[PDB]
Amino acid sequence: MFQKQVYRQYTPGFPGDLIEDGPKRARPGRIMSLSAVNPAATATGPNRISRAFGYAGDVSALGEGQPKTIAARASEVVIGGANFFGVLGHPKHYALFGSAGDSLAPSYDLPDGAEGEFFDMATGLVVEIFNGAATALDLDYGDLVAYVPNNLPTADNALGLPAGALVGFKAGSMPTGLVQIPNARIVNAISLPAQSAGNLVAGVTIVQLTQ
């Protein structure tokens, strides 16, 4: 539970958080449900914090009759929608609910139908990134970001990546089926070791610049 070790320095940040302050754009949204997704919706995800969500309709209108009150411009988003909405973030906004009875158990998963802060762009955002292949990869300053969609076919998703998992590729190497976040750049440089479908090593968290 507490520090079982001592490193020479603190980590630069936790996934979903902001390291650098600058021009940023973020929007609120409701988490919806992959079950409510009308189409097959293959990719499955637990609303993890460092995931890139997609727009899936609006919930502005309130009521059940013809006269409906548009109370707010509310966005209704899903974890792996093709229409990229924003990378979920700012975990301090939310309330910890625990996991399976233990109310104080660690949890980075937002419950379904909750409200999240989806950064559309940020000077620096800590994101969990993954490997798009089974081989070792090196990400540098000039590296791009693409997130797994909801309808990624089983043949393309051989590694069994999560629903909204941001991958991180090199120019002209986007793993197949993956959709790209425009103008997204890997700022800090890291190395991901070789992985398999069963292992699926969690790629080390990275500072990224979006738009």
Binding site: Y7, K92, Y94, L96, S103, I190, V204
Partner: protein, 45 residues
């Protein structure tokens, strides 16, 4: 390059500290007792 975090990443605040409990409790009621309304009351014993 990122140092491995020691604590597992988690949402900070437990829900229990973000609850306001309304004052008082709602008591479950029963049927009314209206015998005094019908035939009054008398103390003889």
């Amino acid at each position: 390059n990122f140092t491995a975090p020691v604590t597992t990443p988690s949402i900070p605040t437990p829900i229990q500290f973000l609850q306001t409990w309304l004052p008082g409790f709602v008591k479950v009621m029963t049927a009314a007792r209206k015998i005094d309304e019908i035939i009054g009351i008398d103390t003889v014993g």
